[PDB]
Design a protein around this nucleic acid. Structure first.
Ligand SMILES: [Mg+2]
Ligand SMILES: [Mg+2]
Ligand SMILES: [Mg+2]
Ligand SMILES: [Mg+2]
Lengths: 96, 48, 261, 55
RNA sequence: GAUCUUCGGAUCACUUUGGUCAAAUUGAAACGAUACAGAGAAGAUUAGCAUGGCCCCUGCACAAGGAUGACACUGCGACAUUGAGAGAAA
RNA sequence: GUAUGUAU
């Protein structure tokens, strides 16, 4: 344990609140859980489609799987990476 | 799906960067057993 | 005033290529086998507009610097009477500027491969490339009947060997307008595309000559009156004495001489 | 570094006067005071253009 | 409108509009279908590392892969002559 | 008969 460094407070979540692109409101927890769980579903879908990788579909339970069954040439395009998958499986937890 | 929000779609990926940070604020708020529901506060991107 | 050609409108839903186009949420199109069916095979329009019948007053007419409605030329402008954009043909007065197509849509760098609905701002085209049906030699009576309505023409060419037409136009605004209206109509659907430079040297020189003439007319308003007075004076004289006299008097240069006297 | 969330507002409206130089002709001057302002970039939007490689 | 106060007269509040189309064939991915051909190192089989960019995909990656990812040239010449013989032009 | 490219 280090003894903490002197610094001014950054705080991300109050910078975003100071631009005109974010608004504030108060709601129920479970609503805003679903909100996220959805938001993330789409944010992956839009990434999957922008790559034109449209023969795989994520289940609504963050479960990725192929439909077509692919050539080796069409698999190398799929091969999503160490990040996206980690990001995904962190969603699978949030959903539960 | 619809074209009416074909603008947003650029930002929507832009959000992805700050998803892991949304998970973490959410779970550090989980309501606890004795509570029936819990009200919270929020920042949303007006883009949804 | 105005006519709302279709009050109702069209709502888009589809499953083309039956077993799964999927739909790419990123760019709203479907994706599957038979890309050749998407490249060719465009289906006939449900309506075409009639100029004299449909055209009228609008909310735009009151506003000085408006554009025309794209859906008017298509012949389906659901608003019609209370439409925001103009419901007429482009005249010589309407004008517009370089980077803007008559319908308001911005121009681009340098064309499409398959020649789309808008053209480049680097070269000017008063022309139109078509692909039409061929009954007999009364085709030219049919072509001249329809295309003449959309605007003032310069010259209709109709090659009978290959069912194609290079239709130039007087005002460039009519050309952009004409292409949309003619396109996707029957006389298969007519095919409308921007024209590549016509083959051979002589024809290009003839076109270059026309464009140069167009530029000269545009410049002509700009030039000084004395310069204007001259070329005109010289042509009439075709004078020498007058010129000599002028020279003697002279002996911001004009301004300086004016300032002295 | 793209400076995530770190969004700064150069929020002084820069005022200017613009003396035009008889462009086509006609009206000449006036001087016209422009008022510049910086539209404040949405935090999210990723890069707006690709990396074109040219010799 | 509200608060003072002569019916005059104050005082408080001040210019919106994140727009690549205004209505999904002709202005923002290509892949896919089909046909051909069908995988470096001078017998044949075979690991690889590099090498150079107007070739690029996967990848958080200044790891690593993708056939060793794929593609990859090698006449000229800064011209002397010698000595002899034959030819046409001054 | 694909890995990998050429043509419509
Ligand atoms: Mg390698
Ligand atoms: Mg090998
Ligand atoms: Mg290998
Ligand atoms: Mg190599």
């Amino acid at each position: 344990m280090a003894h903490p460094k002197s610094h001014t407070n950054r705080s991300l979540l109050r910078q975003l609140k100071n631009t005109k692109f974010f608004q504030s409101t108060s709601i129920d927890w479970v609503e805003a859980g679903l909100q996220v769980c959805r938001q993330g579903y789409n944010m992956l879908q839009l990434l999957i489609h922008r790559k034109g990788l449209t023969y795989l579909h994520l289940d609504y339970n963050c479960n990725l799987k192929p439909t077509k069954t692919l050539t080796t040439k069409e698999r190398k395009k799929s091969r999503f990476g160490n990040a996206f998958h980690l990001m995904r499986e962190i969603l699978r937890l949030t959903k539960l | 799906s619809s074209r009416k929000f074909r603008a947003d779609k650029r930002s929507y990926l832009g959000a992805l960067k700050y998803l892991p940070h949304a998970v973490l604020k959410l779970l550090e708020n989980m309501p606890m057993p004795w509570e029936e529901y819990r009200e919270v506060k929020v920042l949303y991107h007006v883009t949804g | 005033p105005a006519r709302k050609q279709i009050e109702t409108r069209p709502e888009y839903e589809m499953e083309p290529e039956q077993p799964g186009q999927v739909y790419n949420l990123w760019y709203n199109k479907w994706s599957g086998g038979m890309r050749q069916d998407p490249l060719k095979s465009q289906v006939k329009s449900e309506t075409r507009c009639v100029i004299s019948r449909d055209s009228g007053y609008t909310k735009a007419d009151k506003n000085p610097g408006s554009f025309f409605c794209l859906y008017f030329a298509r012949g389906m402008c659901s608003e019609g009477s209370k439409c925001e954009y103009l419901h007429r043909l482009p005249k010589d007065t309407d004008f517009f500027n370089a980077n803007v197509d008559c319908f308001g849509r911005e121009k681009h760098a340098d064309y499409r491969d398959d020649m789309g609905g808008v053209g480049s701002f680097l070269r000017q085209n008063y022309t139109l490339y078509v692909g039409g049906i061929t009954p007999t030699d009364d085709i030219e009576e049919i072509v001249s009947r329809h295309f003449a309505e959309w605007g003032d023409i310069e010259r209709i060419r109709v090659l009978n060997s290959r069912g194609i037409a290079f239709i130039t136009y007087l005002n460039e605004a009519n050309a952009q307008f004409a292409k949309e209206a003619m396109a996707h109509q029957s006389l298969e659907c007519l095919n409308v595309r921007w024209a590549t430079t016509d083959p051979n040297p002589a024809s290009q020189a003839r076109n270059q000559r026309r464009l140069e003439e167009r530029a000269a007319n545009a410049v002509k308003k700009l030039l000084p009156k004395q310069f204007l007075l001259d070329l005109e004076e010289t042509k009439n004289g075709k004078x020498x004495x007058x010129x000599x006299x002028x020279x003697x008097x002279x002996x911001x240069x004009x301004x300086x001489x004016x300032x002295x006297x | 570094q793209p400076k995530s969330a770190v969004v700064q507002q150069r929020d002084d409206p820069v005022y200017i006067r613009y003396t035009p130089s008889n462009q086509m002709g006609q009206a000449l001057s006036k001087q016209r005071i422009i008022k510049m302002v910086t539209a404040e970039q949405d935090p999210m939007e990723p890069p707006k253009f690709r990396h074109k490689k040219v010799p």
